Amino acid sequence: NSKTEQVTGATGITQSTVTAPLPEAVSSLSLAPTVNALDPWVYLNQTEVPGGTFTVSSATQPGSVLLELEISPELNLYTSHLFRMYAGWSGGFSLKLLVAGNAFSAGKLIAAIIPPNIEVPNSAYLLTGFPHEILDFRTADSMEIIAPDIKNIDYHFRGDKLGKLVVMVYSPLRSTSADFEIEIKLTSAPLPDFKFTMLVPPIQNNALPIWSIPQAPPYSMVNPRSPLTPVVELYINSSYATCNHQLGRYTIYQGAIGNSTFNPSGAWTATCTAEAGSVTGNPNWRYALLDLPDNPTFDPTLPPVPRGFCDWGSGVKSGNKQHLVCFTGKKFAGGFQDVDAHMWDYGDNETVGLDNTYQRTIYISDPSLEKDAQYLVIPMGVSGAANDDTVQVAPNCYGSWDYAPTVAPPLGEQFVWFRSQLPASKTTTTSGVNSVPVNVNALMSPDLIRSAYASGFPLGKVALLDYVLFGGSVVRQFKLYPEGYMTANTTGSNTGFIIPADGYFRFNSWVSPSFMISSVVDLNL
Amino acid sequence: NSKTEQVTGATGITQSTVTAPLPEAVSSLSLAPTVNALDPWVYLNQTEVPGGTFTVSSATQPGSVLLELEISPELNLYTSHLFRMYAGWSGGFSLKLLVAGNAFSAGKLIAAIIPPNIEVPNSAYLLTGFPHEILDFRTADSMEIIAPDIKNIDYHFRGDKLGKLVVMVYSPLRSTSADFEIEIKLTSAPLPDFKFTMLVPPIQNNALPIWSIPQAPPYSMVNPRSPLTPVVELYINSSYATCNHQLGRYTIYQGAIGNSTFNPSGAWTATCTAEAGSVTGNPNWRYALLDLPDNPTFDPTLPPVPRGFCDWGSGVKSGNKQHLVCFTGKKFAGGFQDVDAHMWDYGDNETVGLDNTYQRTIYISDPSLEKDAQYLVIPMGVSGAANDDTVQVAPNCYGSWDYAPTVAPPLGEQFVWFRSQLPASKTTTTSGVNSVPVNVNALMSPDLIRSAYASGFPLGKVALLDYVLFGGSVVRQFKLYPEGYMTANTTGSNTGFIIPADGYFRFNSWVSPSFMISSVVDLNL
Amino acid sequence: VTAPLPEAVSSLSLAPTVNALDPWVYLNQTEVPGGTFTVSSATQPGSVLLELEISPELNLYTSHLFRMYAGWSGGFSLKLLVAGNAFSAGKLIAAIIPPNIEVPNSAYLLTGFPHEILDFRTADSMEIIAPDIKNIDYHFRGDKLGKLVVMVYSPLRSTSADFEIEIKLTSAPLPDFKFTMLVPPIQNNALPIWSIPQAPPYSMVNPRSPLTPVVELYINSSYATCNHQLGRYTIYQGAIGNSTFNPSGAWTATCTAEAGSVTGNPNWRYALLDLPDNPTFDPTLPPVPRGFCDWGSGVKSGNKQHLVCFTGKKFAGGFQDVDAHMWDYGDNETVGLDNTYQRTIYISDPSLEKDAQYLVIPMGVSGAANDDTVQVAPNCYGSWDYAPTVAPPLGEQFVWFRSQLPASKTTTTSGVNSVPVNVNALMSPDLIRSAYASGFPLGKVALLDYVLFGGSVVRQFKLYPEGYMTANTTGSNTGFIIPADGYFRFNSWVSPSFMISSVVDLNL
Amino acid sequence: NSKTEQVTGATGITQSTVTAPLPEAVSSLSLAPTVNALDPWVYLNQTEVPGGTFTVSSATQPGSVLLELEISPELNLYTSHLFRMYAGWSGGFSLKLLVAGNAFSAGKLIAAIIPPNIEVPNSAYLLTGFPH
């Protein structure tokens, strides 16, 4: 049907319609062993769907899909919670489309039902070929879409392909003011024919509807790329548009990726085997060969480094002017002796095949090194001319082993880094290397992703996180991606922006990867 | 009613009775805003209650309470899961008491309903003063107890005092065989009058019915008392009947306790301020005074140490024969210079008030230390004559600050320690201290407790954990207490028992603190 | 009759042909092919005793019939045959797990599923309805199916002398059970009955000593594990580790020189075994020629024991001066080469010139080598697929195929001297042949009768799909004699937790 | 049918059942030249069959067959004697299985009818595939 409500002041109308673009084939549930009814009050209340908020404005509708949601129990909060203790489900949902339109705007919206195994077109013209419903910004407030549960079986087990709701702009938004926006909110409630099938213990791989983040401050976060230094501040740099690190790379799906580990402190120390020969032109740059306890046969499919070993950058070919600093000793017997700060770097300069690379072979700048002895390596700083930027860029990774892929934030927003201050190691005698102060940035702390593992991310959504500072305002707002990085909308460049690490993360909602954060941090200080 | 079933072979009978010791006053739910019905199949199935398993054998019933369970939605698995999305509840439960009795045994059981705000007596004779039901081991298989929901209000909000089921042995078990036991299992299902009241978002402080532990191996666990060394093995020592550590002390309720921290690697390094004077008789044992960034005014209510600082033991008064080893440098400018392995210990020997104590003041064994300069301290080993036992016993804690209380395992079971091998720091020149190899044990890794925080422990129960080794058998079985330690039943002494750290923890069930683990590890190798 | 989960008759309107069963198959209760298990006082609570997929394999007749049909539908009726006693008490839980749901490892979680409490006092002759849970009209092959899980709820305690309760499931398809789409009877479901060919053990080849006939089945209390890479076969992928189906043809290998002479023993010269099947030196491929010897000598040994092989120089179309030389794996100074099943070996002979290719035919052991030393194979490292170390369940010991290697005595300076030694193998390929020809039921273990003396003496062994036989034994013995002239007779399919009633008395 | 008798002293029960695992197709004897009836008292008395005694104890059931008897006039003593003066026979037999069991023992027995030209399996699991 359709209901028309005259707005306050009689300057327009408001249409609230109920539409069923596709007739529903109600499953008889004949093969369902049990038909588990829901709480009748679940049908009667409408909850915001995860990822069902979008803002239509100018510079919108070049062909984009505003929201695309699978018709499933995950739409409603209470059905999503209930499904954890159930094995099957059936029945459609009542999709309520809240539109914050105005009588003095212009433009149209189209929402369509897309059956399973059908790709979503990137054109409203094609989208009109689906069971659809046209919406006008001048008079719309709420479209109740009776979304059917399209299926060729009596009830869904987990993993089945499901129908989708796709909403995109049909005609571009127009308004006199350039700042006008259209808030679009979608809420769901199961249809009265919705049922669950078997009672099962509430342990599932399905993501929790709400992720509860412990109020752990960022300073209590271990820095994967600098375990011995606490995280002191959250960092944003417009220059750092790309991360290639192998440490601090944790993914919601397949655990720690690249060379990352869940115990950065325990995996920070590594041992290397000494061999004869040195870098050409530098007789004291003795070659070393890192031990691979997890890859004893040195399979190319396995990482050519110990797990969690340092991935700091030292420049392309910069052995003359900068290096890496590690504590180096020799294991005499039941321990290491004569441990001192030595000078080291990856590769051997010149050949780009293995220099500035994350391979097995390294060199240590001291003549007393003798072969084939085992030597301790604890990377602890940079010495010659290294700054924050050169240590930010990790050495490249080659081969067939599963290294962490290079990632970049979507255009318009920057990475948020866990920044720690690495102190310098000054020396007054000739036994040191006289390191230099430097800051180390990591994409992501292991523990917060660990907290995310228990709940999990709905597929496929990114977590919108509120970062609360000193009891309420100011509240910063970030997006956490399942790939293991966190971003924020920015204006300006401000290479060196600082956010205090005294706050705590608070889960806000699930949003699409293309969602724009309403709260934009101004880089310009 | 009562049903008598003749056993197979006619060598006895089997009584399955339904009893209602206390009549139920069904709440009219007149003030309930909504009455949310449950899935009818929830009423029809019986699930094992958390902590509702006990084994009656010989050396039982000296007055003990076998099980004591509050009548609440937490009894049933599905009601416990459902209650997370509800604000109130009402109605009783159908408590099914499975008894694995035999016709050729002897003894009796008594189960009673105890109203709220009434203490549980430790005598069956007193327990007969409650609404009770007598059970005989010869003929019992299942008593259905209609447990009422005793209340003076229409429905329960969270936090209300609830009635209890208490089961204890009425007459001692007797059998010809000395190894005979009585498995006692209790299962619950809500009564048909059970209802929920308001629909609320499923975010509550209530503990999850099932705790999902990630399959993180113990070697990937950070060692709080030795962050730089990975956990290599799980350790059991019959001698270690008491732990007084301030690191590795994490509690499900109030976070990290004592001096423990969630980032052991980041808090391992500390700085001290040098002052004039040395320990009497040792001019080179220069006094040092640890900096307290979190306690700048040095309030006695706050810890007199930096968070997460080393709590290793060095003996009562043993400065002559053993010490602690730390890397010590002086912060010249923007970093520390001349960092070398130095010799240090808590207190100043002699006075027990501050020596072998966890207070602010320490001494460092070098003459070149000058005051009042700031010095780096990274504890990394022990030098003189320290062994595993002396480092196991942490220095004592005094004052009004909230230090981690000394804990001991209940009689019959021993602590399970996260053991790591700390390598020695040998020196060939005169600039070292020549440390000694030693092992460091911690009660509990921070991350596993962190995983426990998301789910939480039901109050008040301990988690029974299966430790699976190399794909199934052998499966070791431990109890994890909310205070932050893990135990196991043992036979023998075997000071130095070793359990591989390659497994993973798997949650089994919730049990009472007094529960005896069926799987007993034999200490004698 | 108890039904934890109701049966929903699946109409079968979409079935092309509804193939009705023989009506007498419904009326005859038949033992479940694999639903046999034992409960003992040593069985830990919460341990899974029986995992049964609700499929046409629950009944002997339907299991045989299913090989002709592409689809099926309908549940089963299960009857408990509990050989209980008057003295034991305990509980069992039988839960119905719907498809695509993981089986929990604790009784606490298992009680969440539809279930039934089985008390040994009254569990006998109790009827269990095994529902067919599906959202489709009928099942195809390879579809996920519901499970029947039987777990110990209360441990079996006895008021008298301890007894082991034996429980057998008996099944009959429910009257709604139907088949669809007749297909040729070559389908993948394992045969409910396995017909072992009549062949004595002594007619089988010893994988770890092809040249020596197996003359004994051997049980040792001290062999708690097996790390061999030879004689390792599985029902699923056949030969595993470095095992081969032609041990005799794969026994000989060749090696090449290195220009090295071992640090400490100049007479010991290394060698690099060539890998015709691994010429690209792939770490993920075995760094050993296929089927090559995996005898063990010890750790940091060599001054007291080695391996003996026939070594010759290949000149042209043959070999030069084949003589018994004395060899061993890896070096003798580093872990990862010594006592490691890898490419590098050393041969004790002064004359081993540059880049020459030398034949290697392992033949025995020398020095202070013992049966125990050769029993333990060298370790395996790397990412190449090697056979995992296996151990029998507690209370059961491996049954070995024992051979008698004769010594080789030399009265001159040419050649070395060997010591008599016995070599054991987990399994000859001959027995497994028909086994994976017919297949094993999912998760079940073949119970075999070793018929001896024409039937007067019959030993019972459990043949695991992983490729070893275990025997229930009492007492301890460093070596047990079993004649190899008998033959194996298939008894039934049992769960791996089943305890063999007939116990071998080792201390005789 | 089935009859349950309570043992003396009430320390157990005793089941005496009558079972017909395979329905009998009674021959009409249409081609029989004469149908020679037996003494009615022969049907009424039960005689021990030759070879129909076995002792089940420990070290038993490794797969063995305790007894295997052909259904023939040789089962009964009087029918065996009578068959000597007769050329043909038809009809089944009432096989009574005396078991000296006790309530405080454990174990089970399976008895099956095996049709002609079918080999006897050496496994109880296979034997369950017969009318048993």
In three state form, how does the secondary structure of C59-112 look? Answer: CHHHHHHHHHEEEEECCEEEEEEEECCCCEEEEEEEEEECCCCCCCCCHHHHCC
C-alpha distances (whole Å) from C492 to each of B48, B176, C201 are 35, 37, 20
Give, in degrees to the nearest 5, the angle at Cα B406 between B403 and B409: 145
Q: Which two tokens stand for residue A252?
A: 């919601």
Method: cryo-EM
In sequence order, the β-bridge partners of residue A18 are A144
What is the distance in angstroms between the Cα of B135 and the nearest Cα belonging to chain D? 23
Alpha-carbon distance B379 to B369, whole Å? 17
Contact A392, A314 (CB under 8 A): no
Decide: D100 and D93 in contact? Cβ < 8 Å. Answer: no
DSSP assigned state of A391: H
Reduced to 3 states (helix: H, G, I; strand: E, B; else coil), residue A96 is strand
Residue keyed to tokens 């009770």: B132
Specify the DSSP element, H or E, that contains A390: helix A388-392
D122 neighbourhood in chain C, CB within 8 Å: 449, 489, 491
Q: Chain A contacts of C113, Cβ < 8 Å?
A: 199-201
Residue C255 is which amino acid? C
**Strand C445-452 and strand C487-494: pairing?**
antiparallel
Provide the shortest C-alpha distance from residue C340 to chain B (in Å).
21
Distance CA A256, CA A254 (A): 7
Give the strand pairing for A106-114 and A132-136.
antiparallel
Q: How far is CA B54 from CA B165, B167, B514, in A?
A: 14, 10, 10
Tokens of A279: 């870098």
- Which residues from chain B sit within 8 angstroms of residue A216, using beta carbons? 262
CA dihedral angle for residue C361, residue C363, residue C364, residue C366, rounded to 10 degrees: -60
CA distance C297 to B221: 37
Contact assessment for residue C121 and residue C175, using Cβ atoms and an 8 Å cutoff: no
Task: Say which residue the tokens 């209890």 belong to.
Answer: B164
3-state helix, strand, coil split of chain C in percent (to 5) is 10, 40, 55
The DSSP-derived string for A186-246 is EEEEE-TT-EE--B--S--SSPPSS-------GGGS--TT-TTS---EEEE-SS---B--S
Residues in chain B: 525
**What are the C-alpha distances in Å from A8 to residues A16, A17, A98, A176, A181?**
15, 19, 18, 21, 21
Q: Rounded to an integer, what distance in angstroms lies between the CA atom of residue C216 and that of residue C484?
A: 5
| Three-state SS annotation for chain D | CEEEEECCCCCCEEEEECCCCCCCCCCCCCCCCCCCCCCHHHHHCCCCCCCCCCCCCCCCCCCCCCCCCCCCCCCCHHHHHHHCCCCCCCCCCCCCCCCCCCCCCCCCCCCCCCCCCCCCCCCHHHHCCCCC
Neighbours of chain C (3+ CB pairs under 8 A): A, B, D
- In DSSP notation, A297-317 reads T--TTS-SS-TT-------SS
How far away is chain D from the Cα of C171, in angstroms, using its nearest Cα?
A: 11
Inter-residue contact D21 to C27 (CB < 8 Å):
no
DSSP 8-state symbol, C261: -
3-state secondary structure of A80: helix
Q: Which DSSP symbol is given to C203?
A: G
Side-chain half-sphere CA neighbours of B233 within 13 A: 12
Spatial CA neighbour of A224 closest among A418, A58, A38, A481: A418
> What are A's interface residues with C at a Cβ cutoff of 8 A?
30-34, 87-88, 153-159, 198-203, 295-302
Task: Please tell me the distance from the alpha carbon of residue B176 to that of residue B186, in angstroms, as a whole number.
Answer: 26
**Euclidean distance between CA atoms B387 and B385, whole angstroms:** 6
- CA distances (Å), C32 to each of C6, C132, C434, in order? 21, 16, 22
Put simply, the answer to whether B179 touches C161 (Cβ < 8 Å) is no
Pair of tokens at residue B44 = 């029809």
How far apart are alpha carbons B15 and C119 in whole angstroms?
A: 12
Residue C256 belongs to what H/E stretch? strand C253-256
CA separation for the pair B305, B311 (Å, rounded):
10
* Residues C297, A393: Cα–Cα separation, whole Å: 51
**CA A245 centroid distance within chain:** 15
Q: How distant, in Å, are the alpha carbons of B213, B466, B471, B501 from that of B507?
A: 7, 6, 16, 17
| Residue carrying the six token digits 């420049």 | A315
> Which neighbouring-strand residues pair with C180?
C18, C71
- Residues whose CB is less than 8 angstroms from the CB of residue D55 and which lie 6 or more positions away in sequence, other chains included: none
Q: B213 phi and psi, to 5 degrees?
A: -95, 125
Structure tokens at B78: 């599905």
Contact between A39 and B196 using a beta-carbon 8 Å cutoff: yes
**Residue B267 to residue A423, Cβ atoms within 8 A:** no
Element (H, E) at B452: helix B446-455
Report in angstroms the alpha-carbon separations of D19 from A2, A316, B42, D96, D111.
Answer: 74, 91, 43, 10, 11
Locate A446 and state its tokens: 């292991």
Question: How many angstroms separate the Cα of C301 from the Cα of each of A294, C298, C331, C380, C421?
Answer: 27, 6, 10, 18, 17
* DSSP run (H or E) holding C430: helix C429-438
Residues of chain B found within 8 Å of residue A250, distances taken between Cβ atoms: none
CA distances from A78 to A74, A96, A209, B445 (A): 9, 16, 9, 35
User: Which residues of chain B neighbour D5 with C-beta distances below 8 Å?
Assistant: none
Beta strands in A118-208 (DSSP E): 132-136, 140-147, 164-174, 182-190, 195-196
Q: Contact C36/D125, CB-based, under 8 Å?
A: yes
**C-alpha pair distances (Å), D61 with each of B476, C376, D58, D109:** 36, 36, 8, 10
DSSP-derived 3-state class of residue A426: strand
Say whether B78 and A84 touch across the interface (CB within 8 A).
no
Phi and psi based region of residue B338 (left: phi greater than 0; alpha: psi -120 to 50; beta: remaining) = left
Contacting chains of B (3 CB pairs or more, <8 Å) are: A, C, D
The residue among C289, C419, C298 whose CA lies nearest residue C363 is C419
Residues C154, B98: C-beta atoms closer than 8 Å? yes
Residues with Cβ within 8 Å of residue A176, at least 6 apart in sequence: A104
Whose tokens are 């099957």? That residue is A88
Question: What are the C-alpha distances in Å from A482 to residues A402, A454, A461, D125?
Answer: 18, 13, 8, 54
Distance CA B312, CA B333 (A): 30
Enter the tokens of residue D101.
């069991």
- How far is Cα B294 from Cα C442, in angstroms, rounded to an integer? 61
CB C121 within 8 A of CB B8: yes
End-to-end CA distance of chain C: 48
Name every residue in C having a CB less than 8 A away from some CB of A.
5-8, 10-11, 98-101, 104, 109, 112-114, 131, 133-137, 283-284, 287, 336, 381-384
Specify the 3-state DSSP secondary structure of B177.
coil
State the Cα–Cα distance between residues C223 and C372, nearest whole angstrom.
Answer: 9
Distance, in Å, from the CA atom of C14 to the CA atom of C8, rounded to the nearest integer, reads 16
Chains C and B, touching by 3 or more CB pairs within 8 angstroms: yes
How far is B246 from A467, CA to CA, in rounded Å? 31
Identify whether the C-beta of residue A344 lies closer than 8 Å to the C-beta of residue A325.
yes
The answer to whether the bond into D92 is cis (omega within 30° of 0) is: no
Alpha carbon A40 to chain centroid, angstroms:
37
Q: Are strands C268-273 and C344-348 parallel, antiparallel or unpaired?
A: antiparallel
Q: Determine contact, residues C61/C170, Cβ cutoff 8 Å.
A: no
* Dist CA B413 CA C369 (whole Å): 44
Q: What single DSSP character describes residue A117?
A: T
D82 phi, psi to nearest 5 deg:
-70, -35
Q: Which residue has the tokens 């870098």?
A: A279
Q: Measured over all CA atoms, what is the biggest interatomic distance in chain C, rounded to whole angstroms?
A: 86
User: Nearest to residue D106, comparing CAs of C84, B102, C499, B6?
Assistant: C84
Q: What DSSP character marks residue B310?
A: -
Cα dihedral C232, C235, C240, C243 sign: positive
d(C-alpha A13, C-alpha A136), whole Å = 12
Amino acid at D74: E
- Count of H-run helices and E-run strands, chain B: 6, 31
Q: Rounded to the nearest 10 degrees, how much is the dihedral formed by the CA atoms of A163, A167, A171, A174?
A: 180
Q: Helices A446-455 and B446-455: crossing angle, nearest 10°?
A: 30
Give the integer Cα–Cα distance in Å for B136 and B169: 10
> Residues in chain C, how many?
508
Cis peptide leading into residue B474 (ω within 30°): yes
Q: What is the per-residue DSSP string for B363-410?
A: EEE-SS--TT-EEEEEEEEB-SS--HHHHHSPPB--SSS-PPPPB-PP
